[PDB]
Amino acid sequence: TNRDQESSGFAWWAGNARLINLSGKLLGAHVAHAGLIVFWAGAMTLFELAHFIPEKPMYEQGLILIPHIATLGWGVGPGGEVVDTFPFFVVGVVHLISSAVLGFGGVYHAIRGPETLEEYSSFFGYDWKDKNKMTTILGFHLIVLGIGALLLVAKAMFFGGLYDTWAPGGGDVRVITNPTLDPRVIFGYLLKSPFGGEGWIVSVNNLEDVVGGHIWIGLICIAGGIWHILTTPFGWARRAFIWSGEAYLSYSLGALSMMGFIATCFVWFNNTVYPSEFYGPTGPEASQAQAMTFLIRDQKLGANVGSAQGPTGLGKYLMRSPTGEIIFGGETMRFWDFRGPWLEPLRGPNGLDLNKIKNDIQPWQERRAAEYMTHAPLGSLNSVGGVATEINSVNFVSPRSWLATSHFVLAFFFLVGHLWHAGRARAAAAGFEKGIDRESEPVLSMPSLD
Amino acid sequence: GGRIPLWIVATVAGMGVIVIVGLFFYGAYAGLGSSL
Amino acid sequence: SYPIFTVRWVAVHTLAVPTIFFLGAIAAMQFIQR
Amino acid sequence: RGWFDILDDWLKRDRFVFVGWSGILLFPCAYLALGGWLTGTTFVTSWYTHGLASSYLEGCNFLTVAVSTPANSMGHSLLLLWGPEAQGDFTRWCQLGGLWTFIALHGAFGLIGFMLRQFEIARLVGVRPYNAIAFSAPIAVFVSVFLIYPLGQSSWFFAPSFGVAAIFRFLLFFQGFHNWTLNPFHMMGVAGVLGGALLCAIHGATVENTLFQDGEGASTFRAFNPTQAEETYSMVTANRFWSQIFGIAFSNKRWLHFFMLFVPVTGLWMSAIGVVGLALNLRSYDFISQEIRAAEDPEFETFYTKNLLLNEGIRAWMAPQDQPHENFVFPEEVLPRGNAL
Amino acid sequence: TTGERPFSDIITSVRYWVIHSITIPALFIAGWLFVSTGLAYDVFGTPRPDSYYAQEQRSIPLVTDRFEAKQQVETFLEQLK
Amino acid sequence: NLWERFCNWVTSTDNRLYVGWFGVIMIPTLLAATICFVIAFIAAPPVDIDGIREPVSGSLLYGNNIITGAVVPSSNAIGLHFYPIWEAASLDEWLYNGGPYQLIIFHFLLGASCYMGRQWELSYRLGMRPWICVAYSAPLASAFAVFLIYPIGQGSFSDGMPLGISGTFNFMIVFQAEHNILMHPFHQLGVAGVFGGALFCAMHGSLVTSSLIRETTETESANYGYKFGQEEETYNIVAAHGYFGRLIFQYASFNNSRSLHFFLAAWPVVGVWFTALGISTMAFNLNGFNFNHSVIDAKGNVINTWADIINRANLGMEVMHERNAHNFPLDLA
Amino acid sequence: EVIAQLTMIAMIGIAGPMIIFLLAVRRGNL
Amino acid sequence: MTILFQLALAALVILSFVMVIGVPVAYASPQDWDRSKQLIFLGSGLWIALVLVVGVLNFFV
Amino acid sequence: KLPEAYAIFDPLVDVLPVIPVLFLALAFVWQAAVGFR
Ligand code: CLA
Ligand code: CLA
Ligand code: CLA
Ligand code: CLA
Ligand code: CLA
Ligand SMILES: CC1=C(/C=C/C(C)=C/C=C/C(C)=C/C=C/C=C(C)/C=C/C=C(C)/C=C/C2=C(C)CCCC2(C)C)C(C)(C)CCC1
Ligand SMILES: CC1=C(/C=C/C(C)=C/C=C/C(C)=C/C=C/C=C(C)/C=C/C=C(C)/C=C/C2=C(C)CCCC2(C)C)C(C)(C)CCC1
Ligand SMILES: CC1=C(/C=C/C(C)=C/C=C/C(C)=C/C=C/C=C(C)/C=C/C=C(C)/C=C/C2=C(C)CCCC2(C)C)C(C)(C)CCC1
Ligand SMILES: CC1=C(/C=C/C(C)=C/C=C/C(C)=C/C=C/C=C(C)/C=C/C=C(C)/C=C/C2=C(C)CCCC2(C)C)C(C)(C)CCC1
Ligand code: OEX
Ligand SMILES: [Cl-]
Ligand SMILES: [Cl-]
Ligand SMILES: [Fe+2]
């Protein structure tokens, strides 16, 4: 059974470590956990829909899943306005039913099915140290992930499109007909610096690049899956890695930690695949919106915003970036790399154009600037909107704040877990994870350092 | 002596603690000290 | 066999009886309206 | 045998809860201090001493409840229940902040009783009394902060109120009015506390990662036996590891554990000395040379001068409500503030 | 190992719950009624939500004299706050 | 083979200081950061941190002392932009805009991550269990939070912690003004972690020192009763457990030394993990609890609490911090 | 009202430990 | 068919509760397993049918 | 809001998302029943 410390060597608080050499029960654990994930997706979608007020913006209602469905072009119209809440309901309900199916399978393999799959089948039974089988399973899952990326491509190209916040006239659901298949453009995002003004793959600012990158990712994942089904690890790969279940877990933990940090930065900075109609403005967006709002107000009052001098001698409203571009003044000079659909019509070749600023600011831009200024991603833990010194009137914390904070916590803890399991896999492969042998202590066989 | 299993005692006591602290958070959102 | 009322009994009840009393009090406070 | 010896024998019997001679002082005082804090944070207001709601009955949560200090006009009165201020009226005694002095005095005598308990148990089981010597540092902190500091000031009002947000107020008050971060005694206290946390973490991790394999279970906690004569971990391996990682390492276990005693105790004692200095308003508030230069040169700026401006903001913006007895009416135009905001 | 019945043995006994399913709810109800009848306000002098201020008053009833503090509190209470 | 000899030297356990491959990255970055820090702390010219052409003096030669000196963070005009030496036209421009801060913090973060890796590496070479690096991940996460993650969330390396004592105090006070860190539960967990770490450090030291087995006289130090590498236990854990189990009660006392030392490792590390996560989650502006005007009487008058007094202090810091840098009512970042 | 949500969550939160109790009562593989 | 749709969804909820309690109990009790096997099959089939019914009755309600 | 034909199932939906947390708690309950063996 291996369901106690004496038989397994693991205490109850490490009891899932008893599942390492038990393929059937481990499969049950995985399938039940996948059922848990799908259950949260469906139940959270239904919870968010049940409290959804469609006339209020999504970012004011504490929603994180409905904006994801809206970004896919389901249920929304021009400007992000909800036209139909039934697709959200369908997504939630189908996830809940599929989660019931996955929970049934997980429970069956965990407590009723065979504890080891090796006797029942050679296809499904696996040994962790069988490199060929591990690469085969990895190849199957790579093909599955590539099919998922191509499913996003299919939704964007043939099944209604995606919400484009950069669409002409305003954000709208648009079918992407010309994805960027150029490897220079696609793989130029991977070579971009992660620092200010460059932003690496977080700086993707159009859906054509998104769809082209997903075509490339789906094709690459399918090709790599076929590659790992057809091949065995090479000698350098065999000598460079530890080949055990905990080692593979630690590799995945490091990868997931990196992806968690990337997603944190993506939801904090990107407003293309996280449109500000659904997720609210970014921090840079809100600061630029405040500067824009007071520029409009004082320009209506008669101020010459190009020549107004702030207290320090810099431009109160307009100043120059370190490379000469005309940018908004004040502290929001740190956010001059921000690009947004409401701000781009006033940007010329040298930055913000003074003539367009004087003559071309439309009322929808003013409404957007005021709305994004007053919905800055700043809030308290008990969902009080505004700075830490604000009074209790506004019940608002941005979804960008919730997603970024939660996934930074998760990414850091998964880095810690990767360190734990990588060290433990190395020690267990080397044979001293349970401590130092008294009769063969290595340090006692080493010369002194004086 | 051991007529009622200890796991039942622990489960019931923990559920009571959970109910009490959930009531305390609900009262943080309702009545006195709710800012409304 | 075992005595019932000890020093340990006194310490436990001097901590536990006011704890339950105060918990009931604060639970009643949760339904107070201004 | 005499009544004293019989009572001593009963007091030193082995129980679930040891009592001892020190128990007579410890258990009443400690129980009364804890019960007073819970009773105050549950039922007792600060409306007449501070103009604050500070109880669950008024709608505060766990972070914002406090047993607040007495009003400033009470001075350093002991505020006994039978004393001339309360005159035996328990309700008025609660309303005048008598629960604060109740908790403070019973807590002080409970801490005395606890250190006496440490001494008595150390004598009984035949061990050296280094735990009581280590506990002298939290006693020094409590005496300096809750007793010596208000005695140096005008009243009990400026002592910490027994509460979470009230203690946060105490921290911010010390920053704004005393520049307590700039005090070298507080710096030694911070060094002692953070070094003690570092030593705790690093010693625990070092022991857990140099354990001898004394069992075949993956969970290594079972392998230790309480009465074994051998070290459960390798001191030689740990010493070599830290010698090659950090340059220096412990080689004496007794010195290691004395050092673990020494660092946070010394830090807390230094911080208590600094708190006595602040009790007399003898602050490390300013550096005179930088003050003179910044006065004579409006382009000289350091983080210290920025901190001074922050302290001016703290004092001006918190003084009318944190000190209601002064009747501070600061008009809007006298409040220091930067541009905008 | 000190001469008392172990806590696990006591709290798993039926007789313990026979006593305590009566005593624990009685104490809980006693605290609930201590708050809900308003006896806590009278015992500890805590203002009711209608008792912090007089109807037009926005000043805080702060005691300013040491030996007349009881009389000051009674005057503040007599002011219909 | 030359490469094989170099690999044998790098991974050698006979070097006085272990190098390893994490060390071949760690040593140059830490040396660069240390040398640049010493040179900047002594002799750097004033730095325009706010980007408002009001330079802040941080070095000893320009009027500071040990307490007030700092390496000032890079300019707010730079923001999150990468600012190496070769991106500046001259060294005078680089020093004006706070380039040494970026150089030092990037080299230090790289070197400290490789220090964690090097701790793992030496533990592996010596046949140890590998989780000392996991314990070191808590201060490393704290350093990443205050030097990298908070600038990323706020959008400028000017909001990172200055490399100095008074600059650190400025960072603390402005952070409390803008995020109410004291009312954040993660920082409260961190304070519990460090207070408990000091408590359990003093407790473990005093209990072990209390139960030291007599091997000396009153003339000599008790520390000479222990010899390096002795097999026998230098103190009686049974006596210490008896003392502590009579001090509180028996089942509150560890009798397993391994469990006790795991607790000593686990408490401050988890607490500091949570406070580093607190700094990062307030970097994404998820601030501490806001209870301002929470208690309301029957008519609707605000009844102040201690949280409102904290709010007054925070308002003072907020209106005075960076007194020339704001042009608009909301301090959005 | 709120009583409906409380009834639902009570039924689910007892449905868990009911599974555990039923397995312990009939001496299951638990 | 709003009352019919509500009845079908209520039946689905009640059967989901019954199976959520009973499937782990049946799986972890070998002693009567043969009999419980048939019930599990029946329940699964009925549950699937109820889901389909509700889905179709979603669009005519 | 949900579609109106699902309206009477609104309270149940209101308690659905916290079900995964209970699963974690359920593990401990199970481990308490076997005595944390
Ligand atoms: C995602 C969470 C998760 C999952 C999927 C698992 C899964 C598993 N654990 Mg596990 N565990 C977890 C969390 C989890 N654990 C946690 C948090 C702890 C710490 C307390 C443990 C501690 C632990 C120990 C100590 C051990 C396991 C073991 C096991 C395996 C055998 C279980 C068994 O025989 O129990 C039998 C128990 C029962 C039959 C009781 C009923 C449980 C059922 C499954 C509840 C189902 C409820 C659900 C509502 C049903 C829906 C059905 C519907 C969809 C039709 C199994 C694969 C064991 C193992 O390794 O096996 C070798 C083992 O010894 N676990
Ligand atoms: C996909 C991710 C993943 C997977 C599959 C595993 C798998 C495993 N881990 Mg691991 N781990 C992970 C991530 C992961 N880990 C991360 C991210 C960390 C860093 C925190 C760790 C840290 C870690 C340690 C330190 C140890 C393991 C161990 C183990 C083994 C036994 C685990 C067990 O029985 O848990 C039993 C489960 C519990 C006891 C429950 C823990 C409860 C958590 C800590 C609190 C969760 C709070 C919740 C999210 C929010 C509050 C809820 C509310 C109710 C209060 C198993 C092979 C053990 C090992 O090495 O065995 C070989 C071990 O000692 N893990
Ligand atoms: C990762 C998931 C996974 C994996 C690897 C397995 C693996 C296995 N299952 Mg299992 N199972 C699962 C999920 C899974 N199952 C789920 C979710 C359920 C609930 C319905 C079950 C219910 C179940 C039962 C009742 C039994 C098994 C059995 C088996 C074994 C033999 C099955 C066989 O020959 O299939 C042959 C192949 C097929 C029958 C074709 C299936 C085609 C599917 C439906 C295509 C689905 C499309 C796509 C790939 C899935 C995407 C889903 C995703 C979106 C969530 C094998 C070890 C048997 C066993 O162990 O006997 C001893 C057995 O009796 N399983
Ligand atoms: C989930 C995805 C996944 C996983 C886990 C693996 C796993 C594996 N692959 Mg693989 N592969 C995949 C997808 C995946 N593959 C796909 C999609 C393709 C098609 C493009 C391939 C094509 C492929 C080939 C052609 C080969 C492998 C090989 C291997 C094995 C050795 C890995 C190794 O040493 O690389 C670790 C990485 C390196 C050694 C590269 C150097 C590390 C640099 C310095 C890191 C730089 C990145 C840095 C972190 C910055 C990030 C940003 C940057 C990208 C700009 C291992 C079993 C090898 C093998 O044994 O084949 C059987 C091999 O030759 N893979
Ligand atoms: C042994 C434990 C102990 C200790 C050390 C204290 C100590 C204290 N209590 Mg306290 N208290 C205790 C137990 C204890 N209490 C218990 C069990 C209760 C519950 C009933 C209380 C209830 C209580 C209240 C309600 C108050 C105190 C207060 C005080 C403080 C001032 C008391 C004072 O001045 O009287 C000093 C009295 C003595 C030292 C006794 C003198 C004994 C010698 C032998 C002389 C006896 C002379 C002769 C025999 C009799 C004289 C009669 C006649 C000539 C007048 C002081 C710090 C007050 C306080 O905190 O103020 C803020 C307060 O108001 N206590
Ligand atoms: C192994 C194990 C475990 C685990 C388990 C798991 C994890 C499981 C899973 C499970 C799952 C994952 C489950 C699921 C379920 C579900 C269900 C059963 C559902 C149903 C549904 C329904 C009935 C629906 C309904 C509706 C609709 C249709 C619409 C409207 C709304 C409503 C909701 C009404 C534990 C930890 C305990 C430990 C021991 C062992
Ligand atoms: C453009 C675009 C896109 C795309 C993207 C892509 C195409 C990506 C890819 C990417 C990739 C393609 C990635 C990769 C990565 C890699 C990594 C991450 C690596 C790792 C490595 C490792 C881990 C190694 C290690 C080592 C060392 C260092 C030494 C020796 C030993 C060992 C081996 C351990 C998307 C979709 C977003 C959309 C939008 C746009
Ligand atoms: C002052 C006074 C007095 C005293 C009294 C007393 C001594 C009382 C007591 C009282 C008490 C003795 C009370 C108690 C209370 C308690 C409570 C109210 C509790 C609560 C709790 C809770 C709520 C829980 C929590 C927790 C934690 C802590 C952590 C973990 C988690 C949890 C959440 C579970 C006399 C008469 C002498 C004289 C006159 C004056
Ligand atoms: C969707 C749906 C559904 C489903 C559901 C489910 C899936 C459920 C499950 C559930 C569950 C799965 C539950 C569970 C619960 C649990 C509990 C409530 C527990 C708690 C715990 C505690 C309280 C603990 C305690 C303790 C112990 C025992 C030991 C140590 C200490 C302590 C204290 C921690 C139904 C059918 C209704 C129908 C419609 C819809
Ligand atoms: O730079 Mn450093 O501290 Ca963060 O909030 Mn906005 O920016 Mn400035 O004011 Mn407040
Ligand atoms: Cl400042
Ligand atoms: Cl500004
Ligand atoms: Fe030790």
PDB file of C-alpha atoms and ligand atoms in Angstrom, chain A residues 10 12-17 20 246 249 253 413-414 416-417 420-421 424, chain I residues 21 24 28, ligand 2:
ATOM      1  CA  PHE A  10       7.888   9.687   4.185  1.00  0.00           C
ATOM      2  CA  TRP A  12       2.262  12.371   6.428  1.00  0.00           C
ATOM      3  CA  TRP A  13       3.249  15.974   5.653  1.00  0.00           C
ATOM      4  CA  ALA A  14       5.326  14.597   2.754  1.00  0.00           C
ATOM      5  CA  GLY A  15       2.712  11.958   1.945  1.00  0.00           C
ATOM      6  CA  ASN A  16       2.394  12.817  -1.740  1.00  0.00           C
ATOM      7  CA  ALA A  17       6.061  11.811  -1.996  1.00  0.00           C
ATOM      8  CA  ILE A  20       6.547   8.785  -6.756  1.00  0.00           C
ATOM      9  CA  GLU A 246      11.737  14.880  -8.512  1.00  0.00           C
ATOM     10  CA  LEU A 249       9.400  18.239 -11.188  1.00  0.00           C
ATOM     11  CA  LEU A 253       8.990  24.293 -11.172  1.00  0.00           C
ATOM     12  CA  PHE A 413       7.157  30.349  -4.129  1.00  0.00           C
ATOM     13  CA  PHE A 414       7.655  28.191  -7.214  1.00  0.00           C
ATOM     14  CA  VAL A 416      11.663  28.315  -3.862  1.00  0.00           C
ATOM     15  CA  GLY A 417      10.078  24.955  -4.679  1.00  0.00           C
ATOM     16  CA  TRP A 420      14.106  22.686  -2.889  1.00  0.00           C
ATOM     17  CA  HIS A 421      13.400  19.918  -5.395  1.00  0.00           C
ATOM     18  CA  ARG A 424      16.871  17.267  -3.185  1.00  0.00           C
TER      19      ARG A 424
ATOM     20  CA  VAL I  21     -10.109  25.024  -0.441  1.00  0.00           C
ATOM     21  CA  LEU I  24      -7.263  20.792   0.954  1.00  0.00           C
ATOM     22  CA  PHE I  28      -6.228  16.831   6.780  1.00  0.00           C
TER      23      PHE I  28
HETATM   24  C1  CLA J   2       3.431  21.484  -8.971  1.00  0.00           C
HETATM   25  C2  CLA J   2       4.133  21.739  -7.863  1.00  0.00           C
HETATM   26  C3  CLA J   2       4.625  20.828  -6.856  1.00  0.00           C
HETATM   27  C4  CLA J   2       4.565  19.453  -6.722  1.00  0.00           C
HETATM   28  C5  CLA J   2       3.989  18.398  -7.555  1.00  0.00           C
HETATM   29  C6  CLA J   2       5.227  19.118  -5.435  1.00  0.00           C
HETATM   30  C7  CLA J   2       5.336  17.808  -4.951  1.00  0.00           C
HETATM   31  C8  CLA J   2       5.891  17.449  -3.742  1.00  0.00           C
HETATM   32  N1  CLA J   2       6.485  18.263  -2.815  1.00  0.00           N
HETATM   33 MG1  CLA J   2       6.645  20.330  -3.071  1.00  0.00          MG
HETATM   34  N2  CLA J   2       6.789  22.407  -3.198  1.00  0.00           N
HETATM   35  C9  CLA J   2       6.267  23.149  -4.216  1.00  0.00           C
HETATM   36  C10 CLA J   2       5.592  22.646  -5.367  1.00  0.00           C
HETATM   37  C11 CLA J   2       5.334  21.340  -5.647  1.00  0.00           C
HETATM   38  N3  CLA J   2       5.683  20.241  -4.836  1.00  0.00           N
HETATM   39  C12 CLA J   2       6.507  24.562  -3.958  1.00  0.00           C
HETATM   40  C13 CLA J   2       6.060  25.644  -4.826  1.00  0.00           C
HETATM   41  C14 CLA J   2       7.217  24.648  -2.763  1.00  0.00           C
HETATM   42  C15 CLA J   2       7.671  25.872  -2.085  1.00  0.00           C
HETATM   43  C16 CLA J   2       6.685  26.324  -1.039  1.00  0.00           C
HETATM   44  C17 CLA J   2       7.386  23.282  -2.291  1.00  0.00           C
HETATM   45  C18 CLA J   2       8.023  22.918  -1.093  1.00  0.00           C
HETATM   46  C19 CLA J   2       8.117  21.635  -0.600  1.00  0.00           C
HETATM   47  C20 CLA J   2       8.762  21.178   0.650  1.00  0.00           C
HETATM   48  C21 CLA J   2       9.406  22.063   1.621  1.00  0.00           C
HETATM   49  C22 CLA J   2       8.615  19.803   0.665  1.00  0.00           C
HETATM   50  C23 CLA J   2       7.870  19.445  -0.560  1.00  0.00           C
HETATM   51  C24 CLA J   2       7.620  18.041  -0.672  1.00  0.00           C
HETATM   52  C25 CLA J   2       6.950  17.496  -1.739  1.00  0.00           C
HETATM   53  C26 CLA J   2       6.582  16.025  -1.922  1.00  0.00           C
HETATM   54  C27 CLA J   2       5.489  15.653  -0.915  1.00  0.00           C
HETATM   55  C28 CLA J   2       4.412  16.726  -0.801  1.00  0.00           C
HETATM   56  C29 CLA J   2       3.274  16.451   0.131  1.00  0.00           C
HETATM   57  O1  CLA J   2       2.874  15.385   0.594  1.00  0.00           O
HETATM   58  O2  CLA J   2       2.605  17.596   0.464  1.00  0.00           O
HETATM   59  C30 CLA J   2       1.698  17.527   1.583  1.00  0.00           C
HETATM   60  C31 CLA J   2       0.937  18.801   1.635  1.00  0.00           C
HETATM   61  C32 CLA J   2       0.839  19.575   2.731  1.00  0.00           C
HETATM   62  C33 CLA J   2       1.490  19.232   4.016  1.00  0.00           C
HETATM   63  C34 CLA J   2       0.044  20.836   2.701  1.00  0.00           C
HETATM   64  C35 CLA J   2       0.886  22.095   2.767  1.00  0.00           C
HETATM   65  C36 CLA J   2       0.000  23.314   2.934  1.00  0.00           C
HETATM   66  C37 CLA J   2       0.561  24.585   2.300  1.00  0.00           C
HETATM   67  C38 CLA J   2       2.008  24.811   2.683  1.00  0.00           C
HETATM   68  C39 CLA J   2      -0.274  25.803   2.681  1.00  0.00           C
HETATM   69  C40 CLA J   2      -1.114  26.299   1.523  1.00  0.00           C
HETATM   70  C41 CLA J   2      -1.854  27.577   1.869  1.00  0.00           C
HETATM   71  C42 CLA J   2      -2.959  27.875   0.862  1.00  0.00           C
HETATM   72  C43 CLA J   2      -2.397  27.985  -0.539  1.00  0.00           C
HETATM   73  C44 CLA J   2      -3.724  29.148   1.209  1.00  0.00           C
HETATM   74  C45 CLA J   2      -4.359  29.072   2.582  1.00  0.00           C
HETATM   75  C46 CLA J   2      -5.496  28.070   2.644  1.00  0.00           C
HETATM   76  C47 CLA J   2      -6.397  28.238   3.867  1.00  0.00           C
HETATM   77  C48 CLA J   2      -7.130  26.947   4.163  1.00  0.00           C
HETATM   78  C49 CLA J   2      -5.641  28.687   5.103  1.00  0.00           C
HETATM   79  C50 CLA J   2       5.955  15.977  -3.331  1.00  0.00           C
HETATM   80  C51 CLA J   2       6.757  15.122  -4.279  1.00  0.00           C
HETATM   81  C52 CLA J   2       8.301  17.413   0.516  1.00  0.00           C
HETATM   82  C53 CLA J   2       9.458  16.595   0.029  1.00  0.00           C
HETATM   83  O3  CLA J   2      10.592  17.000  -0.225  1.00  0.00           O
HETATM   84  O4  CLA J   2       9.206  15.273  -0.149  1.00  0.00           O
HETATM   85  C54 CLA J   2      10.176  14.512  -0.871  1.00  0.00           C
HETATM   86  C55 CLA J   2       8.853  18.572   1.394  1.00  0.00           C
HETATM   87  O5  CLA J   2       9.380  18.399   2.486  1.00  0.00           O
HETATM   88  N4  CLA J   2       7.561  20.518  -1.277  1.00  0.00           N
END
